[PDB]
Amino acid sequence: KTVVVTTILESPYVMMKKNHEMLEGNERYEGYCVDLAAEIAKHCGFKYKLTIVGDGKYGARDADTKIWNGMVGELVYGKADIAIAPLTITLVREEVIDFSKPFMSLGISIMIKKGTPIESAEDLSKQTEIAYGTLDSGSTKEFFRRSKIAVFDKMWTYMRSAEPSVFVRTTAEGVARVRKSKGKYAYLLESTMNEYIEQRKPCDTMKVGGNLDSKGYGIATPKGSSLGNAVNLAVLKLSEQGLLDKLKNKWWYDKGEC
Amino acid sequence: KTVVVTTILESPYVMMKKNHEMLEGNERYEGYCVDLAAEIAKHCGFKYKLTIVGDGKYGARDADTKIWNGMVGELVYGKADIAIAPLTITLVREEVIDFSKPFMSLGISIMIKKGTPIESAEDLSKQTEIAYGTLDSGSTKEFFRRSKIAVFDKMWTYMRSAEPSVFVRTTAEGVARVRKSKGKYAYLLESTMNEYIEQRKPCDTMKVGGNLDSKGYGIATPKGSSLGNAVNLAVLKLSEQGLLDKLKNKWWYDKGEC
């Protein structure tokens, strides 16, 4: 049985090859998570098919219908065997799906346009001239919605009722907004994506401050799935052999344009 | 039924209180893991007894007999219900015990006496005047033993054969050897412990270079244990609520002496 892999188009984890339409199957895609999937499958001894999640979301539970969307939804409702993506390990997700040990570490961070008068979250919360927001339907938004820490609680109170909305549908949208807002918009996003963008032309954004928190991306499988064990062991093995470090360098830094 | 907790005396995770002589049971101890254990037991709803692992080791497998020692052995042979300590999540351990999601990140790092002409692992490998080693029966030693990476491979070849031994029984002994070697001994140990010691009198050691790898500490339980599920969720909860960050600051930086 070919394993169905749900993933998401997010640079540099999964990207369309410049010549996608003249290629087929897995060959259309490239990136950190494409390289990671290849190995995981090799070490676990399975065949797979990469598929981009339909709604383009990571995964959240609708408060009304209680239905899970995104990659999480694909696993919960039996559409996918495994998720290989920058999917954050969280308590609410861990209750409905299984995660491997983290294959990459990260934290919520601040992306600003270079020269923006902001050095930290506390700085953001103490002012109003500079707008700020997060990705919609992600772990970053939930972190702010749920936090009991004063600075973050305050930031959430502003963001949830700010208008027009400070939330974006895609990371790309968030970055575009920072770049076009002449320093009047700051974007809250995971450090890994912040670091990648920082190394790309036009080289006009920058990560400021330390991270607001600390967590990991995990490879996800449906609850109680037989894949979980092998996949978890493969991540540990690839970690120890230095593969993850190698892949980070290849897709983030070896490529640097700034 | 009272949960038997195995742990190890390692600053600032688990330390004897100054007035321990006049205290009983769990009260004799303090530190990050002592606080973590309390919250873990609170959220999982159990009573526990802290016990210091007899052989004072983290845990490795004897190549000849194939018996596990240290905290890993205690779990493997049914002498303990759970290990709450700076126990590194690794592939060989994960094959015999269960680990929670990481409660703390770290990497292998170099500790030197201030002023020592060393800036990196690569440096250490290119010279012979300055001896270097690691802790016996730990994940660090195993990291060098199993490493295919050129610089590390070379470092192991030198360590596994040097006389007198460059290996130490405890972290305290390793640190003491740095402090009294007049810069002729550098110690390879985890960045967490390195960073702690760097902030303590006589303030004569230093962490140099970056981390040689990236991994995590997990709470361990015997394979297939019922405790495992509840404990894992508890770690995720404590991470998200920010308690883990609070504990780190309390035990590492709030205390700073240098």
Add this chain to the structure above:
Amino acid sequence: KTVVVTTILESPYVMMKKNHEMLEGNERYEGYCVDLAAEIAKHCGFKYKLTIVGDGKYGARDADTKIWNGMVGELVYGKADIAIAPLTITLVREEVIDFSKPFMSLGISIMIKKGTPIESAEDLSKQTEIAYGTLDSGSTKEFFRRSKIAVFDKMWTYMRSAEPSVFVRTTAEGVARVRKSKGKYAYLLESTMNEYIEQRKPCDTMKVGGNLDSKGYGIATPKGSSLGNAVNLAVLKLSEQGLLDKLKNKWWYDKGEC
């Protein structure tokens, strides 16, 4: 009865003619082995149908299931009557299928990006900056796995545990890997394929050093198949009539682009 010929897409042995993807039967393909199959069929007096091996592999035996894949498997399990491809004559294969006398000689050799500081296998083995690998599921990989020769043994020890995998799925993937790795990847492959690629645009690769061994390609038929005798006699006749040399010139050197 129409003889079912199993073969594999490998330049310049068998190739899809430009714009023939939709066309019918044998006309679709061109190459050394297409010309060879024609002569063989003529001299043995049979009709045939060319088919491309389903899994795109040459043939190896799964250590776990003990099942043969690729063209070898097609013959072993009765899916095909004969294999006409750059199939290496080896001991493990000769035990389960029959081979004609060789129609072409070759050896394992090194392909590098022009300017790479490597002259020999020994060179490869004494350094770590430049990675190297081979095709998966082929006789080249098995040569290294089995060798008791010091240099090749040392190469296998590195290759079998390197991450990411140094092994490639197809010859084209290995070559693509050499061309894009800026001299950091050397590909081990059979000299005939290496010499072909050397004369093709972009003309940026090179064969270096001598061959590591010496062997031949044979036409393969199922054990005890009647076709065997006549096919073997046919190969010898083609060889003595100079037709194999003619075909070599036509598909390697008459074509040269560099």
